[PDB]
Amino acid sequence: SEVELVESGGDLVQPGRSLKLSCAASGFTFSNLAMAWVRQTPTKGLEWVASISPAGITTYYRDSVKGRFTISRDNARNTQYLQMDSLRSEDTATYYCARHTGKSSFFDYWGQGVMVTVSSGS
Amino acid sequence: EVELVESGGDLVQPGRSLKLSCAASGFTFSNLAMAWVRQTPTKGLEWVASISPAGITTYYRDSVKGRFTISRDNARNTQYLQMDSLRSEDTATYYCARHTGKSSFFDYWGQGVMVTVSSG
Amino acid sequence: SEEQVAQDTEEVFRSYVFYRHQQEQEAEGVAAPADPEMSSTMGQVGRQLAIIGDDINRRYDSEFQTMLQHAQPTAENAYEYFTKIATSLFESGINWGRVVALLGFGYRLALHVYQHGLTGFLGQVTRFVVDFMLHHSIARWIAQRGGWVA
Amino acid sequence: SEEQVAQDTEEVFRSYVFYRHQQEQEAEGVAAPADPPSSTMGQVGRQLAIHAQPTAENAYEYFTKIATSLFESGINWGRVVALLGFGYRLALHVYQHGLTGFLGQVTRFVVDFMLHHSIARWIAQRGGWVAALN
Amino acid sequence: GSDVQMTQSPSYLAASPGESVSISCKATENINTYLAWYQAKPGKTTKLLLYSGSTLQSGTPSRFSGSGSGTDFTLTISSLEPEDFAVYYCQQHNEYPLTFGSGTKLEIK
Amino acid sequence: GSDVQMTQSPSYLAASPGESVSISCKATENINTYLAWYQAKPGKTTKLLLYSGSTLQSGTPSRFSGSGSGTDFTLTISSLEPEDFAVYYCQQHNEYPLTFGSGTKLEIK
């Protein structure tokens, strides 16, 4: 029916640790469209983090997260993931779930946003 | 009847100089961009440098920026590659290549010239 | 044969509308991450014809160069050869460009009627194509040139 | 008017062959190193160089009429642009195999054919050249 | 081998229903005509307004209009309606990595 | 920010006249469809086979065919001819610096 994307994997985490995000989807055939992750940094604006092919074979990453972040998906459960390893004080942002319109690189629908904060204290 | 022939190869010690030269025929030389590609014994195939048809604009790869200089004499139907301060990583077979049109793939190639850098 | 080309249309048209559909949902900008890509004679004919579309002149423009390369026009018999070709764009007749345009019309027929129609309209459109091609001498015109393999 | 389309072709065609040549040798990919017209009819040459919503219970009558219209004699906007493209292939391929540059003598050949075979009037009856971008 | 950077302008806009208003989005490098516009509201989900510089997305009102050459783009809201009060982001989809803009807030004056 | 690196596979291939065969060329970053293929013979000069992923170069036989999305490309020789035994290199022409592949040598089986 109606398209909806819901994220859940937000938390407060220490620097250098790991954290895996999860985005649930409904309202469309999940195994037919490419998904992506976008984050809203307190200073560095809006950043595209990663995108993944419909079947998950091909993945694109941005330079600042290449090697640390891993994007994945489980088409059986209509869910995509974002495994953030070796977190940094710059990875703290609001992470949004986004669906590519078709085979293009702009996004039909978005998620509501999940909060990830990387900090030791203060 | 296009043919490209390079000639400026030799065996040289590191840090010295060496100037390559590529002669062209079978087309209007002053209308197409030329390039140099080298085949490294280890580092595969590398695009080295390209030059505009009139020679005003030149592109270089990062590893050769500052040392290699590409030039051409459209009056003499010849392009050059001035290799200064050669290194043990610059030894390869250097090929002459002609851009197809305004694109970055190559119509015809040269026969190949051998440049070897070694401290003895 | 006129009967052979009639049935070869079934695979040529279906292979045409399939690849015509794969390019109408291509990217608009840089393409999203795509999975790696890892076919009869009439099935491949539909693929080669699947490009172009409304720019049928791209077939005419290419047919210009190849026609300018075949007869090799000069300046002695040019005005006779020039007005003859220019008139051939508007005269009644059948050329390879108009046949591909007919296929593209079937694509817009099968597609645009599926949206506003009660059913999926793939089988009923090949019926519309075979009936029209067989009648208006298109099947005979194609057959006398060797077949779809052209 | 037939008078408007007749001479406006000179600007539309001369701008058409210019932009048609500018894209035939473009940078299919990244460009190699390279060294270092705003009127209505001037832009029309560039725009060309680059409804009834059918139903079900009475479709077959409207379908076979249109399908036959692809082969019949007549004038549509596609054939007019195709005629322009022929002038491009004429001016280009004859410049290569000709002693001189044949742009002025070819625009005459194009206008004459349009004026004769009622094509120029057909364009005028649609409003003019400005009627193609719809 | 640098990244395209989108510069949105202005950052803060104050208008009233009925007025006209425009937002500029400039790119450091050429992006052809591939620029998308998004509409972000505090409560609701983000909406796709335009793509490819000028093509309206299914459901976008006709009062929205986008113009853009190669590195200079403009979004234009003609007759401003109360529903057209949100934060607007431009994103180029001409090359990877995809790049958004800082954002433009359209507040009520 | 980094250079695209083409990974050709397989490195060594042995086939016979008449058979069909394909060679894969992968890119580290997106190169859209701008991949060229070259044919290198021991005696003769290197020839341009394809460009822009699928466009045959003037003079290339119809048995050559290339397909490729964005980071995954394939060269395909349909009906293998005895003259078609050589070494093949893929090169991206989507951004500078231009990058070639390691190479694939096609010997006689």
From Swiss-Prot, chain C:
A motif (BH3) lies at residues 45-59. GO terms for cellular component: BAK complex; Bcl-2 family protein complex; cytosol; endoplasmic reticulum; mitochondrial outer membrane; mitochondrion; pore complex. Zn(2+) binds at residues 131, 135. Expressed in a wide variety of tissues, with highest levels in the heart and skeletal muscle. It is found in: Mitochondrion outer membrane. It is a single-pass membrane protein. A motif (BH2) lies at residues 140-150. Keywords: Acetylation, Apoptosis, Host-virus interaction, Membrane, Metal-binding, Mitochondrion, Mitochondrion outer membrane, Transmembrane, Transmembrane helix, Zinc. A motif (BH1) lies at residues 88-107. It comes from the Eukaryota. GO terms for molecular function: BH domain binding; channel activity; heat shock protein binding; identical protein binding; metal ion binding; porin activity; protein heterodimerization activity; protein homodimerization activity. GO terms for biological process: animal organ regeneration; apoptotic process; apoptotic process involved in blood vessel morphogenesis; apoptotic signaling pathway; B cell apoptotic process; B cell homeostasis; B cell negative selection; blood vessel remodeling. Signal peptide: none annotated. Disulfide bonds: none annotated. Belongs to the Bcl-2 family. Homodimer. Formation of the homodimer is zinc-dependent. Forms heterodimers with BCL2 and BCL2L1 isoform Bcl-X(L). Forms heterooligomers with BAX. Interacts with BCL2A1. Interacts with RTL10/BOP. Interacts with VDAC1. Interacts with GIMAP3/IAN4 and GIMAP5/IAN5. Intact BH3 motif is required by BIK, BID, BAK, BAD and BAX for their pro-apoptotic activity and for their interaction with anti-apoptotic members of the Bcl-2 family. Plays a role in the mitochondrial apoptotic process. Upon arrival of cell death signals, promotes mitochondrial outer membrane (MOM) permeabilization by oligomerizing to form pores within the MOM. This releases apoptogenic factors into the cytosol, including cytochrome c, promoting the activation of caspase 9 which in turn processes and activates the effector caspases. This is Bcl-2 homologous antagonist/killer. The chain holds residues 23 to 179 of 211 of the full protein.
